[PDB]
Structures are given as C-alpha cells and as structure tokens.
Amino acid sequence: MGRPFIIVKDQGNKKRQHGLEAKKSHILAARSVASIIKTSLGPRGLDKILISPDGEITITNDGATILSQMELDNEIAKLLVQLSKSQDDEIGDGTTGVVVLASALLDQALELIQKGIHPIKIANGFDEAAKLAISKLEETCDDISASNDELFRDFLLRAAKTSLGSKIVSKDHDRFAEMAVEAVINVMDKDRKDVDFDLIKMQGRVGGSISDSKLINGVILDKDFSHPQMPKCVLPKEGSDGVKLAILTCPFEPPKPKTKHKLDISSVEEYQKLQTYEQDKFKEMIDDVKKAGADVVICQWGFDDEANHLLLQNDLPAVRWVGGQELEHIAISTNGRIVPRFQDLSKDKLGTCSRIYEQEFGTTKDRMLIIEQSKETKTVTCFVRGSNKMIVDEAERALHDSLCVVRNLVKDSRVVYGGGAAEVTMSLAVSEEADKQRGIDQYAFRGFAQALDTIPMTLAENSGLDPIGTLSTLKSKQLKEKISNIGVDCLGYGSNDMKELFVVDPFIGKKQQILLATQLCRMILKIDNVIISGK
C-alpha cells in the first residue's frame, strides 16, 4: 500500500461523525435553535431582527419567517427550517411551537439514549404515545357546528383574537379581528363551506398609522389614470347604478398581425387612403365603446396618445397598464367576464361598481384607486397601513396568520382550547397509561409526557409566573376535575378558566405540532453517519 489512500474525491473537506458523541451535538444544536425562539412563544413574546445580504431589513416573531432566509451551516437546523415551513404552508400557525416541541422530544430522548435503549425503539414509544395523546384530545373535544350562524360568528372572534394577540397588532384586538372575520363572510357558501383562499387578496401601503386601516370590498390598484385632467371620483347617473366596467386584454392600438410583415405602399393614392383607414378606425373604435355604454375602460397595455384624448372627450376615463395577474381579479368582484376582442363587446359582459375615487397620500407623486361595493361580492382585498415599511409587512404577516387560522375553522369546526390546557391534558393521559403498560417503553411515555410540559413551562417562564406553582397546580387540578379547559394565564388575570378569557385554537393546528415533531425526531435519531462537505 502507498501513502495516497483515496476512495472518493475531496476527502479533506468531507469529514464523518459517529458514536454517541456525534448524536449528542445534534440534540444540543437543536437547543441553540430552540432557545433563540423560546422567548418569542406566547403573548409576552419578543420579535427578532433579520438582515439580508442585500441590506433589506425586516422584523418578526413567526418561527418560519425567522428561520427562513437565514445563512445556516448545520444540516439539522435546516430540517427545522423545513419544519416550521411545513406548518406554515399548510396551517400557517404553530411554527415556533412545533420546533420547541420537537426540541423537547429530543432533549428528553437524550437521557434515554444515554441509558442503552436503541434510538428507533425510543421513537416507537412516542408513536404509541402520540396516537394515544391525540385520541384522548379528540375524546374531550367540543364541536361548535350545532350552533347557528349568529353564535358561530362570535366564535371566529375568539380564535382570531388569539393569534392576533401574540403579535404587535394587538393594540386594538377587537378592531382588527373584525377585518379577519368580515373577509371570510363574503366567500363562505353557508353550506358545505369552502374558503376559496385564492380570491382573498392582501395588500398594504406604507403610510399613515395602523389605526386608519379599514376593510374594503374591491381591488386595490397602484397606478394612475391615462390623463390627469380626468375626474377623480366617478359616480353613477339616474339609472343603472353599476358603472359598466369594461375590461380589455388588447389595448388601444392599430391592429396588426403577430408575424413579420411589410405593407407595400403604392403611389400617392394609397398613401392618402391609409390616412382615412386609421382615422375611420378610431371613429369606429369610439362608436363601439359608446354603443356598449361603458364608463370605465382598462387595458393591460397603454393606449396611443391620440387615443388618450379621444376617450377624454366623451367623459370616458381610463386606467392603463393594469398588470396581467391583477386584471383577472377585477372581473370576479364586478361579476363580469373579460372579452377576447372588441367585436364581441356587448352589455352582458360589462362590470358593476358602486363608486370609485382616486386617493391621494400626502406629497408623494403616486395614485391609488379604491373600488368599493355596496352589496356582498365574491372577493375581498385587505387595506393595511402603518408608520413603517416593516410594520406593514408585520401587519400583513400577522393578518395572514390570522387569515389562515380562521381558514381552518371553516373546513373543520372542531376546535380545542390551548395555552397549556391541551398539553397538560395530553401529558397525564400518557402518564396514567405508562404504569399500566410498563414493558420497556415506559421511559419513552414519560419522556413524551415531560416533553409536552415544556410548552406551558415556557409560557410560565415568559409570563414571569413560577413554573413550580403553575405546573403543580395544573397537574393536581386536572387530575382531580375532568374539565379540560384550564391552562397558563399569561396576561395576569385572576382566574385561569379559559371560558371567560376568549381564547380558542383549531384542532388541526394543535395536532400538527405533535405529528410533525414526532415524525421529524424519528429521522433525527436515525442518523449515525454525518458527512458535511466543506464549501
């Protein structure tokens, strides 16, 4: 054998790990990621500052937004980035809890790895404990579908105020929670309801204060009219209160084919003839629009100059350059449909709007249209404001999280009561079954029990209350009484019963914290060889 010994390329940068000590760094690496976001859990949380390479700055407390767009080196933390993200995409809530709960299972599992139990056998104990935990939570779960729409209207506020309470938007939780609830009233079908999330748009303008945010029914545009001499506010006249909004794909331009072409122009007879061709085209153009009776015309592309003036004569304003993705959303709210060409334009395919106005914002040289509807229409668009760029992004993300929390209530009415009540309820359920089923996996049931207790202890740690008195009170009280809606009161109220505190969470959201955590940690424990190729 020679001094060179090579099997794979770049052995110097590639380095393996093995044994018990290699797994020890993985769980302890999760503690560093968990300990960062441990303080941001609950209503008493504190946000995190993020800085991109390009200099753009943002602030937030959502666990998926924190872990996202961050430079990482270890692979296990990148799995936690994909975790939180998982909960976000589907659920949109619980991103910090699933990471803290996943780290709690790993911290309790290390003691056991230290005794001589195989790691896959530890994960088998959490699976039987997790299915028994979710099964016991389903047994003590209350359903709110039997109530009528009036009482069910109130339940959306109890859950919308919960998720908005853990953000900076909670200065007026009664006011902004109506924005998250009123947007879903306009899309629900009132029977076998579906959310239809794609219709609900969301846009926020940097300007003013957050208190001036008001919900509207229409589409927000970030562009001006074709000419500034047109009137700002356009009202209807004596009959047909709908303004007959005509939407167009092809702009005001000369017709020509797509393929390459050269129009052979003869002597002066043909030169003078083509001048009458386009001049009669615009006369045919304006007669076609007036025959349809439209009052507002929008195209995705700019009209010709001569065309901008020809519309201004007949009291026919126009907006130009409306984005292609933005053009489709206007037709849905107005109960219209987009014409392919101008020859098919008729009365049936025109729009309907209550009123429009061109809103000014201080001394800036920009114009925004605000469409409003007097009756219940299909879509709805949020109108968020704030005194910073990041606070609008925080209000958009806080409203987006609340919009996804209420989205779960529509598809699944079976709700729960979190805040430490579901955790202690599910912890003692597996503990009471541990001493019945001693076997060898009893330590895994106890580790799963103590792992669930880290969440209400984290809420007790952030709220300043004693975890000894808080944990002992919940364990002693919940073992005595069967009522399972008592948890950790973080705002400092005198009563811990959550019937009066107006806090509600979904069952699909709290379930995914345990499922995505216990299913990830099986993968984390099954790693033995760890090769990291240095960049």
Partner: protein, 50 residues
Amino acid sequence: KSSGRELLERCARTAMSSKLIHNNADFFVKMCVDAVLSLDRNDLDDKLIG
C-alpha cells in the same frame, strides 16, 4: 388456495422495515397494494407510479 389481495400486503410488510414507515405501515401498505393492483398485470410500468 389463499386470497390474492392478502399476498401483496404480506410481502410488502417486510419492505417497510428499516424505514420511517414501520409504525405507520398499517395505513400506507394499503396504498401501494391497491395502487399496483390497478395496473395491468401483462403491462406493469414504472413511470405510471410517479
């Protein structure tokens, strides 16, 4: 003279060991068994299981 449906479930149970599925194999083994049975026995293709 046993049943044909239980044959695929019996042999697929061995494949789901040494993976993340071995506890959730009660539900997912029915998926792949019913999935492959829909295919034609004469022409079993590997690209139709994407």
